[PDB]
Amino acid sequence: QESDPLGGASKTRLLVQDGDQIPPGAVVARTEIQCKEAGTVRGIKEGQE
Amino acid sequence: PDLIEIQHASFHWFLEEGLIEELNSFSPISDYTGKLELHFLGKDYKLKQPKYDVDESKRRDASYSVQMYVPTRLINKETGEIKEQEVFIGDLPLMTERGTFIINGAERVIVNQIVRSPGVYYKKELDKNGRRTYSASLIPNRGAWLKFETDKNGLVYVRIDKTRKLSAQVLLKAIGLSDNEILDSLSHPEFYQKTLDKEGNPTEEEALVELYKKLRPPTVSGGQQLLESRFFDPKRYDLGRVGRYKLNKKLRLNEADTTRVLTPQDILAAINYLINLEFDVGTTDDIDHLGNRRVRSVGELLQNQIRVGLNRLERIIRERMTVSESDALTPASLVNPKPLVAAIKEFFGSSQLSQFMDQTNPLAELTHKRRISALGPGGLTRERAGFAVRDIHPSHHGRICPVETPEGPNAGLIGSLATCARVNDYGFIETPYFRVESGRVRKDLDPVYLTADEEDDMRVAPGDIPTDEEGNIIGESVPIRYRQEFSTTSPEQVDYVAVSPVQIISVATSMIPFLEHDDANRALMGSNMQRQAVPLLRPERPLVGTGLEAQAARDSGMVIVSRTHGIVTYVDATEIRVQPHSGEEIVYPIQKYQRSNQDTCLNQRPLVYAGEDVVPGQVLADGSATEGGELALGQNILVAYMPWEGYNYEDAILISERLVYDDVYTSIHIEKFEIEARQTKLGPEEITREIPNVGEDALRNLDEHGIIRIGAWVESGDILVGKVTPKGEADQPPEEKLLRAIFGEKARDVRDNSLRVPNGEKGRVVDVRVFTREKGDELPPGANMVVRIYVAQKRKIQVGDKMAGRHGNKGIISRILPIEDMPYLPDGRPIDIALNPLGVPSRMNVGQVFECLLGWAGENLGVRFKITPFDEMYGEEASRDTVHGLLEEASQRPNKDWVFNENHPGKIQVFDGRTGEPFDRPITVGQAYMLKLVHLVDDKIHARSTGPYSLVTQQPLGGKAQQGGQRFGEMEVWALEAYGAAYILQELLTVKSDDMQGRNEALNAIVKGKSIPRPGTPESFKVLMRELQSLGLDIAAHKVQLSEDGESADAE
Amino acid sequence: RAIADQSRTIRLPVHLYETISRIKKTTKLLSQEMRRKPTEEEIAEKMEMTIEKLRFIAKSAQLPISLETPIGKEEDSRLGDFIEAD
Amino acid sequence: GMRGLMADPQGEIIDLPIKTNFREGLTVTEYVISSYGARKGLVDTALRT
Amino acid sequence: KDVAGDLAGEVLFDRLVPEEKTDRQGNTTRIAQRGGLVWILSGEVYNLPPGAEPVVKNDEQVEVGSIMAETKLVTNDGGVVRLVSNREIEIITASVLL
RNA sequence: CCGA
């Protein structure tokens, strides 16, 4: 409920439902992290997992 | 709001909820056999009425206490036996309506202690330059401290309070967590697994055996019970409500506030924060920040002392239940109240926090209750007090006054709460702020009371910014404080603003007008001298004030305040009666000539008359240093800043005789004398009229029992209580034997032991109360009767008395002149006091000239101004323009045009009283508010010819009360050695101290007019020789004479 | 027996300790009976001893105080600084 | 004239100027800044003798 | 004294040469041989948790409100999810009542 | 605790 402003805003959402047949070894859910502004991405460094 | 609200709220919290938690953590107790159970019903605890009230407890040297009864219930495990009985548990002294306590006939305050708050704190210590290493510290409210470490290699080391360093994985597996949730809980597991290999990974049973190998036959069940008793048990580890709150706040948890023990999730989160601090995320904490420091008032300290006493009491009850094999007891037999009474009496008698009260004037009484001290048990040591703990922090702005502090060795340790400050429910100090929206100060509702939430978040402006009324903040730059830095921003970016320009200062500093034109050290001196003024006979309000005087007089407690609407029906000097209308007569008692702690008067006078309406909150009676419902510490007198003929040379003071004959600066001081008729082995001491070696007319004021009467005049050496004691040795020398052989002279069996007036201390006897055990009283043991005598005296102003203003301008009166010799004004009015003008620009207190000029304008107008400090927000040179405009308007009166001269504004022409000639230059005259301090010359003059001596050293005693001598210390010996003066130094060390034969020989040679003989070895050197011999050292003096060595005998 | 023979500078005999304990029990029982107004006359009655003897026992039961104890809440004063040599 | 700059109780130098004298009167910010140097003088008098 | 400029972005080195040191305890320290300038090319930086992973590559324009990062919430041996009255992400929880 |  309390979020960081510099990191971003997240979605609470579940891709599976109550009583859903999920296979083992797969994903449960995921979130996004919001982008306040638009533009082109610079950044990503070498060798980082 | 009230100013002593912290004391009132803390004692109300103790009486409502604080004691119930102790009585609920107390119950239930059990025996080792498991057959008896005793539990205390704490919610229905009862308070008896006090045996005596405030004044009858003050004059009897007793406490103002209540009896506290907690009803118990004995349930039985063999049968249905329910035994319920009210049980006395101890004596609790009650807080009075002024917020004080009465312990052994003296008023006492419990000052507020500032300590480190419970919670987790991180710091960054480092090597020579080395590695940035981080350390944690988990502080509970009560219990062991959990600390964490990182070295240069990066090992996470945990330690307990005094032990050596062991590994955090060993601690975590000693708890019982799986290794799954440990590294599944962490954010960066690669940093922690680096420490996993070098330290190793133990099993749950393997970890329990190696803490016992370090904390202390290594066993795992013993170590499991050990760690369960250290951190996870109640009544041996309390994290506290504030500790749970701050630990949830720092580590971002939503753990329930009812849990007051430490959990392994908390240690996992602290390990996570410490690891994440090595990757540059998170914030290290400050130890002097006021968000990490809380205030402990009288509720918490009573709760802790009652916890210790209840631990002793339940140990006693468990031992008494385990020893007794026979059952069917009463609940009043198992409870021994003496450890709880002993703990409460120890807390209220012999604590650093329990202080003898400053009761000089209402301002000192109000300031002592708002003191914030950092010393005491659980606080600080004065030897461990560095410079950083005495520095001023930016978080102190608005909360702790930067000016008011002691000048002695405890400078920066004992602080003062500011004016608008307030302590919240968790113990942190908060200050009110107005909201600011779109550049406009809001001022629509109550303020916010930010509890140091304004450093990292808000931009806060002071309350002296210029602002047009019902409008925005004018100017494009607003001074703000932000992230503990001063800066300037636009008014549309300001979040909060202060509510008052005097929010930064305390009450006594807010008493000072034109504070911004004085130096801060002089403001400190002015506050300190304002707390030292004596209440005068006819108090008078200042012609220039600030506006807090009425609230200070209301919240001191020296003012009878009305409560209901009504009509006053009867007023005399001792009683005000009023029927209320909106058990139909309220009687307000008025105290008459009582004694304070500092031997000053506590007198009240009525203000209302018979037959007028009274609003609730109306002042009915005013106190000793209070008139008109406002604080009145001194008088308004006519100054002239000019030098006299060397009589105001170096801060000396010249005054006139009008301040003597007009009863200005006349005060009342009441001294108290006590004598006990003790029980001696040789016989009982009796208080009688028949005293040996006492003449005829030395017994006129004594009654038939040998005690003085009320209203008698006594001087130095007069007998107050005649007492004798049965001496029984009767070893007479031959001189006395021959003199009693010649002239009769039957030697009596008793000797004189009467109570006499000391040197000085003349006055009138006003109260001769006598306490006797067969009258209904009960005494200290071994004393038959106790007589208490109160002697009052009116002290006029004198040469040698101390005098001060509100701007740190102290001085000693050195000359009292007649009014025909004092300088006079061009209307013929003489000057009351001449102050030296050279003490102003070197000491840099310019506000006294502003105050005297404004007071003289108000004297010539008759208006009694009131000016709040920092008044330069309304314009440039606002104080100067106000003062000179009011002086011009006072000079526009039809008869008084000599008051102001436009050629030289603050000055006028002054004539000489002796010659009639005017002085060559115009002189600043005015009306200043001067004060009379407790430092009078009668309490300072002392002299000794020969008195008592010390036990072992046989040197003269010290102190005025025991006729002691002055100490000739080592620096005085160096000063005499830097001269010649070997004979002065030799007689100062031998025949004036600890050489008894030299003492007797010197006194006999001076009395018979002969030469003083040569002294011998002093007594303390022989004591040192015997002490060095008793240490086991063969030390001896030797003497050489004609090829011979011999050991000398110094004991002779 | 070691408590009653040592641990006190001016030592008291064993019968004095048992008399002090008996006086404590008697005062607590007569305070349970008579709830208010404690009475040394009935304390001396229930112990069958003289009241000045009871005062002697209560006077001998006091503990001594050291001459090196500080008077105030500081280290500037000492109890031996106020004792005059006889 | 002007008061200029104050000093910390340890000898450190503050960052802000005081552009007023005692005749014109200091502000609240300047009074806190002057209180820093007053605490310097008091603590040093109490501790270096 | 530390130079603390208040602007987030990517660091660029102009006329700056580093120097790596070895010390007693193992200190990795960067020294300037000759003093130069340090430039920061401005841009808003978003700190992601270490359990997350970005989707957008090293050069791609982002639209309004588009996805920036999504992580893998992967726990094993679970087939059917059943919840009653909480958020409480859980297991199949085949519990019995006799 | 305060005073110099």
Ligand SMILES: Nc1ccn([C@@H]2O[C@H](COP(=O)(O)OP(=O)(O)OP(=O)(O)O)[C@@H](O)[C@H]2O)c(=O)n1
């Ligand atoms: N802890 C202290 C405080 C004061 N003194 C002595 O007391 C004197 C204090 O002088 P005082 O009249 O209190 O202050 P002034 O220096 O005269 O300054 P002002 O006129 O502003 O009061 C000092 O010279 C010093 O010798 C001391 O020995 N130790």
